[PDB]
Amino acid sequence: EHLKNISPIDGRYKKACGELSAFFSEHALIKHRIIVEVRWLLFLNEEELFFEKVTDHSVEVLNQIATNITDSDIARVKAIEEETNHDVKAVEYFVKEKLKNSKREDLLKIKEYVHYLCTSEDINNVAYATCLKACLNDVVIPCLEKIMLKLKDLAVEYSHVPLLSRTHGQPASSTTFGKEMANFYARIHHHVGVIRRVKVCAKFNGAVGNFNAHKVASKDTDWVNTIGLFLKKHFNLTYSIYCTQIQDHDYICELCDGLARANGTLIDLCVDIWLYISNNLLKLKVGSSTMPHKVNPIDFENAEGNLHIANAFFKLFSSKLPTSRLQRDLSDSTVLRNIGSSLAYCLIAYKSVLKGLNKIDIDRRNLEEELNQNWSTLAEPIQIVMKRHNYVDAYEELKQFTRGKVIDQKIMQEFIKTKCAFLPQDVVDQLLELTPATYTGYADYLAKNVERLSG
Amino acid sequence: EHLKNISPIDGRYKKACGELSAFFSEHALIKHRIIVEVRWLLFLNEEELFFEKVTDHSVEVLNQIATNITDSDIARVKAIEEETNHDVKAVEYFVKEKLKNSKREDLLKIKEYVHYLCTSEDINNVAYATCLKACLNDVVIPCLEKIMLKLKDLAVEYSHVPLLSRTHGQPASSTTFGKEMANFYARIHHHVGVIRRVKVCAKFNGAVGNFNAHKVASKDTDWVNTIGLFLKKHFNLTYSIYCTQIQDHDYICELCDGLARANGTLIDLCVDIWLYISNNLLKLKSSTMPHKVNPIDFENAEGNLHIANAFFKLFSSKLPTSRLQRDLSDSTVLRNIGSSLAYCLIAYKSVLKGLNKIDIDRRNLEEELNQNWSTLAEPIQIVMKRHNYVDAYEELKQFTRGKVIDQKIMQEFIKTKCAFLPQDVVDQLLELTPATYTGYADYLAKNVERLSGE
Amino acid sequence: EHLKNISPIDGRYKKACGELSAFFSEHALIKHRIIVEVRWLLFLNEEELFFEKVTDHSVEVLNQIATNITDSDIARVKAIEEETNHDVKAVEYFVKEKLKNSKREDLLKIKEYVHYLCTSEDINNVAYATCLKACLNDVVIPCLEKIMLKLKDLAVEYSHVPLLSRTHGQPASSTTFGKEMANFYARIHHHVGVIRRVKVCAKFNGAVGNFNAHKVASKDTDWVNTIGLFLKKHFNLTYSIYCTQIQDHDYICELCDGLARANGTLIDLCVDIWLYISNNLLKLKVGSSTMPHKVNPIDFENAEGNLHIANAFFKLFSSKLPTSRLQRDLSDSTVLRNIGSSLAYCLIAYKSVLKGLNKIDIDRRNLEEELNQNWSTLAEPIQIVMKRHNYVDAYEELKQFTRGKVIDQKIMQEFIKTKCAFLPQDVVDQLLELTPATYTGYADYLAKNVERLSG
Amino acid sequence: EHLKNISPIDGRYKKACGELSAFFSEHALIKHRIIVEVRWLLFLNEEELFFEKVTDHSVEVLNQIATNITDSDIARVKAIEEETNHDVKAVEYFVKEKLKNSKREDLLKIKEYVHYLCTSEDINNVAYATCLKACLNDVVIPCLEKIMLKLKDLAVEYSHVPLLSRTHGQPASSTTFGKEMANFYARIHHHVGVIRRVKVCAKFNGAVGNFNAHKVASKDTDWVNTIGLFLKKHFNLTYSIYCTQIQDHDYICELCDGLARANGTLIDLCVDIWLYISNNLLKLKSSTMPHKVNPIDFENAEGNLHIANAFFKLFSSKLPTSRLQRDLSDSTVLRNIGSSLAYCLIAYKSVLKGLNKIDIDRRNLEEELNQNWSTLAEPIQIVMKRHNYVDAYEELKQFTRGKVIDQKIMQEFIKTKCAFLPQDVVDQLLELTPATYTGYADYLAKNVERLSGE
């Protein structure tokens, strides 16, 4: 009866993406807001800006509010939100309540300083930044790196296996299966590196970004330095100093754009794998409800759909998050509640990709037969050699010779024997030893050396 | 506990969109697939194409597999699916086992005909078609029609209330608040009419759309006509004859495009109401300021309409393409139709909540109009021209050079520069104010239902 | 040196789309604005709202301003626009000038009534509506209907030609080449009908949509009825009564969405044709710069790109045109100047599709060999017949029999002979006459009857 | 006559973006392809991989094919293309015929090596890479940097000018005009830094990316290292080793995404300036009203930034996918990179034109602040709390119940409800006004270049 859920995220695919609810769910949002509030009061206590330090034990009681958050804690916040119709204000009340309800006298004194000087977005943006960072570092990017590792394994394992290339869908100079996978490794590797280099930013600046309240409360405090310390020490966050009521969200747009480019590469992979399978060059480990031996690339297909959905959210984010009327409009708040959904679609797709990739094997006989039926792809190296030995208009010579004939091995090798005999005999012999399977350039070297040679 | 859900659809906003799960959830899809399977067998029984009509009571027993589907039945399908890793197959197995266990001879006889001649998409597309049609007809469009009704109520109630227009954000010829709401009514009315006219289509054509199986099974049956009947009689659906393994989905794209255009109009409305409120011209029925009331319903709507539209653009771009006789990437995409409509419903309910908080601020409306006498420049020029004056604009410009234009200056222009006019015309110009220069705004606002057209 | 143009529309592809400049170019916009201004004054003359009718000859002199618009007329408008920095105001001045510069005394009287009561958007929206309507009716939809006719011709011509279907890329029950093309006909036919049914709307309502000026000028005139007459009589346009300073643009969004769905179907076509060619089932009329007999589906590929570009504009339009702050912001004006570009990308793509489709022929031998190597697709009709004669678990019987075997003709027909012998012998004989080429259902009937049977 | 062009890029806005045609037009692409071909042959000559170094003067003659390309040369390539229907092939033919006609023996000898070992995309991708890099470095980014400079000039000049903030469109704690411009400066500075750090990549790897031809032609050459050298020495480009027939285009997507994020920030700015102007707080340096001046530069920018972003979203979604070792659908898409940057340039030039019309309206700024004393609710509560007051919000709410909050009421609250405060603190509260309650807005605005970070 998670089966009665409308979103396939919380419905059909909940098993695939459930680990995300610790980062993104209203429960996790409430939890992290409580933590941010508690950490702020702990920092005010540390700094003694407004009161003398509470007792060592009162500090641990203050801590425990943030380190032991229960389901009932969450229900309590929701209960209060029914009164307030303000979700962050409900958390202030909750934290003050737990302080009132504590034994401690010093804690009863300092409870009025909960949320002191803050605006709601001070709490929210840190909650989101810490959840997003931890989600990507602990769940989403590791899943991407698993796909990357499997592509590298495939690149090395099949580095030598000749494969007929297709440009415009049609036969072209050979590659190897390893090399084609190496190409996807190299791109995913680059995408992961760009994404990991985006800095997750936060701010803590009050009503409109200017420390208005803070300046009145404590005129000799350098609030820019004090907040930078707060965010670094309590959250390991970079501080984006310039903001209105909202953090600008540009780092979210950067991350999402990065993930969206990764997703594009993965869609490219999914469709190529589908096409290799269509052409019977790859086989899948055991399907069709009517044909007993038919096995379909349904993991790649499911992945392709969910990568497109993830990218829809990601385009929405980068398009709408950067704009907010004056010192803010609230339309960004609901949009941001869908960051979790966007990364769920990524995770569903990435896990399907992994499942698909682990099912594939090469079909050597089919790979070989295709290559041996596509001798026309040897046109270029014959011309290249002819030209190296001063032949003029090599392509026209081959064109003339093959005119009105169906090009095959016999014709290509007759062309070498009777039209290239002017070459040194060792060069002629090497032309005669070339096959579409052996004309693969440095595909094998490049495939097995991709870890080292990719930028 | 729904608080641990990742999607805001099933978490924070569950209350606002929960009525959608009867149409769109895996439970709803399972339920409707079972119904399609049962009705196909009922139809084969009616038609006697492959066996003689079963007993009257056996057709009652068959129908009850469809008319009493429980959470238990749903969990059973899911259980079978762990084995099959094929969802529709798991429904075939389920209907068969209900038939095996029925304690009816003639039903044991016909159970091998469950899903006879069908492909899974025959079942899926009818299930989606009926769910989407019912959802729009019963939940989604009536919610849009409630916004329409409120906009028309606002248009009538405030038809006569003058409002300083703004073009490029700056003062322009007056309108009325009711008229500005009538504009949105006329557009939503048009959109709803377009959406209602989209024909919901379905197919039931076997593996690849060609009745391959059907033709072998019963070579003298006119299957085009038989399926037309099946779809109309059992589901009240329009038959789209041409298909591959999949129904083309073009009608879904059309409905989605239509919804997205209505959403764009509603975004236009949300931002304008926000601007009127910002300019203190409307009032509404803040954690720091004691008397501050913010347009948070309209802001929430605005955000959720953008989200619905992201899905809608996705559907319209990806649904139309499928590799050859189909690739399966559409299956997972279609599972998001309910989410897209949940964003709509959340947004529409926020609009309704916001519109019901609206009141005019008459004093601020009047004060603004009374400080924007420069907007009477055009009617003064219009009337000068009517009485054969040449370059009326340059004359007014000449007169106001270096002056800050206000009431005194504009009425001085009329009295001293327009005195050549008939005195009755002079007198009418001198009675004009920005609040009375509203053209047929009041007329158009009151008559919008009657004049908005199709 | 149209080759120095930045847009490929006015550069590389100008030959393909040049007929559009009569509808959409700054030249055409100026031209149609002049016509709208002249027609308004003609209507004021007809109606005698503000002056007694000019002389019969003065009417023809007034007409000739709109029916003889030259390149120098256009340069003159631009010259004036350098002064005004207002493009419509420059047209008012131009029309007044031509009236001043006319002989006529009555025309010298009425020239002050040029643009009388109008706002600039009154002129613009009618200019755009008439250009858009005429462009779609005369150029864009006829090109689409040409593709539709070619698909119908292909559907009928090849209605009988058996073709191995592929679902998930893999073998499935047969169809015919005609039938697959018939499917595209049926969708394009539906799209064209939806698009032709959108009503092109216009308005003519002054500053803010309310007839403010008009009501003061002529209090007893029913302006709603008078404008409806003006738009019908002078332009054959539907009147959208409700507007601000701008016509709402919703009909443009409807048309563009319609074209975008058509484009999606055509992208589906382009990729399917590419895949049939990849699989050597279709051949192209005569390529590769290195392989002498290679001919690539470059027309389909070029079409696929330009359909995506057209759809980018179309998504932009439906997303941004519906919103405009209060009684308008001007950001819609520049957006609308790209309607022409959007339809140029459509026309480039549609002409490439036509060029590609006229190059295709079937490759019967390849079509036949593939079918005859895919006997596994006969699994379903064997099971269907077994079941009709009371066999239980037919699929499992076939599965058991083929276990560990490579399914081929011999195995499938041995299954019929030795596992289906319980069937009436006439049914057994019909099973034994079935081939993948003859198992095509009613594909042939449906393909040749698509004109009549499509909805 | 350019007035007959369909695209506004080459029609109405030709003047604003014409400098782009040197980077992006078919003429520019033809020109750069010729240059790549010539430099490859020059490189084979330097390396002596297939023939001995030609004569000193023959290398001068070869280089001049590249350094003096004319309109005539371009028309010649086009002429050849009518025959070939292959654009790069037409360039091979052109360079060869320049060589055949050169009147040099050693050049007649080596002309068969034009395009040796290459695929057309070897030539195309280097041509695009160099054009895109130069365009961004020389035209596009410097135009963004001019907006940055102006925003910083505004931030400094108006650092101290108080401005009533608006959250949800309604009064909030003050800021300053310079501070609100500093916010945009900091974001554009960040975006420009990201865009500048994208590495422009190229390849030169033959038919399918594997040096198939190269390996057969010269089996002992380290081609990975040789091409690295070619690309760095002749074009100053980074080598992306891994490719199919096509370069992957990922770096184009990254640049485009970066530009699109800068565009979103500039859209945010255009709408905010429009809102400030609407609220009469800024003034600018109408066919009907004689004194009306509209923000048409910002409105034009807003529209063209949406257009640039439509292309950018297109590129990022379609460029990354290519069927197998490539499909040709990317070719026609890449021809639109120049158009996308022309929309950017048009928009950036409109922003610059608008920002240069800006002045503050001090009286209207001051008057608004002086009518919004309710915004001092927070600092009053903050200070009460600091001196141990409990539920300060409820106290102020209690006091203002049923009252329209104004200066008199707020100062009465301080004098009668906050009198328990130290008198110096009371005195400071009584000296606060909404115009002086601006926190560190002035400080942050003046220090933005120094504090915006990377």
Ligand SMILES: Nc1ncnc2c1ncn2[C@@H]1O[C@H](COP(=O)(O)O)[C@@H](O)[C@H]1O
């Ligand atoms: N200025 C503000 N900053 C942050 N949150 C706010 C602000 N004003 C109201 N809210 C609350 O933000 C939440 C927005 O909910 P939603 O639109 O569903 O994301 C509600 O609980 C609002 O009361």
Ligand SMILES: Nc1ncnc2c1ncn2[C@@H]1O[C@H](COP(=O)(O)O)[C@@H](O)[C@H]1O
């Ligand atoms: N040809 C088919 N038609 C319809 N459904 C299918 C087909 N092949 C597989 N399926 C099933 O459809 C479901 C796709 O799931 P998802 O990708 O999560 O939408 C899986 O249960 C597949 O086994």
Ligand SMILES: Nc1ncnc2c1ncn2[C@@H]1O[C@H](COP(=O)(O)O)[C@@H](O)[C@H]1O
């Ligand atoms: N209220 C208005 N209605 C229509 N056009 C206007 C208006 N105000 C200014 N314009 C002009 O519209 C044109 C817009 O140019 P662009 O932004 O390049 O499309 C300019 O010539 C402006 O002067």
Ligand SMILES: Nc1ncnc2c1ncn2[C@@H]1O[C@H](COP(=O)(O)O)[C@@H](O)[C@H]1O
């Ligand atoms: N494999 C290829 N690589 C690069 N260009 C090609 C290839 N095959 C064909 N072309 C040419 O690229 C151009 C594509 O033009 P367009 O579709 O207008 O961008 C045509 O001149 C084609 O002949």
Ligand SMILES: [Ca+2]
């Ligand atoms: Ca194949």
Ligand SMILES: [Ca+2]
């Ligand atoms: Ca205002």
